[PDB]
Symmetry: C2
Subunit: 300 residues, 2 copies
């Protein structure tokens, strides 16, 4: 079969991307029904971003200060509000290309597709993970702010992420579509720090199962181990602690491959303690943590 | 900014994917204007695939033997022909969602986006490279045959690849949209072999430039070298030989980073001769050859 990092098809979301301008500042928005969602920092200059009072900046703006452009065609703004760190611009027109959608706050370790945009135009799509420290490792130039992350199930799009900023360290922070940040981040240009980025253990195990399925299994060993003792090793290598929840989520992959979860944990232990020794697994010389168990099943 | 493997937005191509059935056999097709393009092996059983005479199999089939389904809606087949290894089914209806398009035969080392499908339904999109031996390393289950590869420029889609088969070794072969195979492959279930898979040198250099731009440059050395002497080292590590064409293509990246192409070739030489020594470049522990110079510019 083979094994690739794979985004959801982006066409349903392409139809919702718009440009929003307010002063010089232009960025991407999401047009769903008769509402445009965008980062509230569209109302800031570069000067304001050091110490913005978002109340007082927004109080200067009326409905006509916002220029929403959908391809060639401008929308009329008949209502604005701020919910947390998102701006909700009410427009005259319902989007004809609105898919079935929900807004979801995802958990760290979950994956999603990102459509990266510039002036309301999609340019690229990729699959990523929400890191344990609530950052993402993305591609976001200037003009990409308000680029969005999603999952697709049936023909329901679940919107989980809006891009707001690059932190001084070059990693990325953003909100849900209710405008709450993931992590402790704020929409201001100060020195903000993420915690230690750990590896998502359950995703690693999932990927090892994907490897076995595809015929890569040099890493399978004789040993087994315990949950308890696995976690001591996990602590030392900055792996997330594995729980019984995690074990249960791997059960289908366990069933398909004939390998018990603790036997796979023992394989991993030895890769942590000895390294990969120059060899590769599914064409990679590192342990990949950016596929959930669900993603491996979907693909397999 | 950051740096990801990034597919083109797939929405323009989603609108062209259909199911084609002929006997039991079902696979994906591409509906452009009033023509459906699909792999000619849709007319084969599993038995036929050992030694198919495609003339004689097709001669048994009339127009009504082909069941083209577009979502819920069936098309009427008013003409069939075989061009090389593709079947061209003429239909009654022009596709309303036909984008501006061309068919292009790409060269080895060029990249494209793939939309992987099942029964005329897109499920996933990823970026890949045509390898020097004309194979691709893909994700293709049963039912994915006639999944398509493309590039997008402006709003022109350039269709360059149709998936036909998995070779015994688990790599993938397919055609252009004129039905000529890339490589020496045939659409039959025999033991077929690809040549030695070499690394695409110019793509590696492009990626090193991407690394420099993003602030990863531990690998930059004091040395320089010659084209001639670089290639001797390239030969030993199964890298493609670098030409003056290649040097010229890197000139914009050279201009932006302030590093001459031969100085970068010298960096690479030392990574080949010494390895990466456990360190990473743009989060990778191997040298990536799946971004062209154009891709790095597009993204940067």
């Amino acid at each position: 079969s083979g094994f690739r990092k794979m985004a959801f098809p982006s066409g349903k979301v392409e139809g919702c991307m718009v440009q929003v301008t307010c002063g010089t500042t232009t960025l991407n928005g999401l047009w769903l029904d008769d509402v445009v969602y965008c980062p509230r920092h569209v109302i800031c200059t570069s000067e304001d971003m050091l110490n913005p009072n978002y109340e007082d900046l927004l109080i200067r703006k009326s409905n006509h200060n916002f220029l929403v452009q959908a391809g060639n065609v401008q929308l009329r703004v008949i209502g604005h509000s701020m919910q947390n760190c998102v701006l909700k611009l009410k427009v005259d027109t319902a989007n004809p290309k609105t898919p079935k959608y929900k807004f979801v706050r995802i958990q760290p370790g979950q994956t999603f597709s990102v459509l990266a945009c510039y002036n309301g135009s999609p340019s690229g799509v990729y699959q990523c993970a929400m890191r344990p420290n609530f950052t993402i490792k993305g591609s976001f130039l200037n003009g990409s702010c308000g680029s969005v992350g999603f999952n697709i199930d049936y023909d329901c799009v679940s919107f989980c992420y809006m891009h707001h900023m690059e932190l001084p360290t070059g990693v990325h922070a953003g909100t849900d579509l209710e405008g709450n940040f993931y992590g402790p981040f704020v929409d201001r240009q100060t020195a903000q720090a993420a915690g230690t980025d750990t590896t998502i253990t359950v995703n690693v195990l999932a990927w090892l199962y994907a490897a076995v399925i595809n015929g890569d299994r040099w890493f399978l060993n004789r040993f087994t181990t315990t949950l308890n003792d696995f976690n001591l090793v996990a602590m030392k290598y900055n792996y997330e602690p594995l729980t019984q929840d995690h074990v249960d989520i791997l059960g289908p992959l366990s069933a398909q491959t004939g390998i018990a979860v603790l036997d796979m944990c023992a394989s991993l232990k030895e890769l942590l303690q000895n390294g990969m020794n120059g060899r590769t697994i599914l064409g990679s010389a590192l342990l990949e943590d950016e596929f959930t168990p669900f993603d491996v099943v979907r693909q397999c």
